[PDB]
Amino acid sequence: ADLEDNMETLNDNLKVIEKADNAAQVKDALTKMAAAAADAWSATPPKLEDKSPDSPEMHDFRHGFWILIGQIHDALHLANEGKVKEAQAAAEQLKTTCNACHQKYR
Template identity: 55%
Template sequence: MRKTLLSILTASAVLFSSAGVLARDVGEDMETIAKHYSVVLKTDDAAKMKDALQQMRVAAVDAHRGTPPKLEKQDHDSPDMKDYRHGMDLLIGQIDGALKLVDEGKITEARAAAEEFKTTRNTYHKKYR
């Protein structure tokens, strides 16, 4: 009985700790995106760039599911929430495009594509930050 209880408690701890990692708030996701974005813009190493872009993508997908503080009182289907999610979709698509370029060995082109993330960031930060 004691071993079963210990197993259940251990499994619960793992589940709850991993759920906490996956359920970050939008602000934490944006910090993660910004941190890895600076790596993308500075590195010439394809592996580092790919890893940074992948980390950005994970954070962007998580942020897409979230709600920025400015919109917390709005309905999930409000026009502003739809626009916020559209902006995250744009960013995710841009990240995917840069990842494809890295996979093709086009580091300079991937960095140039990543420069375009700034326009998306600036547009949506003005609205929802």
């Protein structure tokens, strides 16, 4: 529930998806990711600790989780359509969204 644990869950489940052999394994990992991002939403990263809760930076930080949550859902839908490799590929591409936030706020 702290920001570290949420980030590990995100990281770990990205690796679970990469190594997965069926759609159920992918779905489970993706829902775990979504829950971690949702929980991360209310956090203040150390580098934005001096900004007000409703500053543009804090809004944008939260928006970074918003984008990720949408994209995790896109990958979930691919898995439900039986597109295992495509869902795995979509999950890998999530790193772009991971990195976008890290570059600004980590």
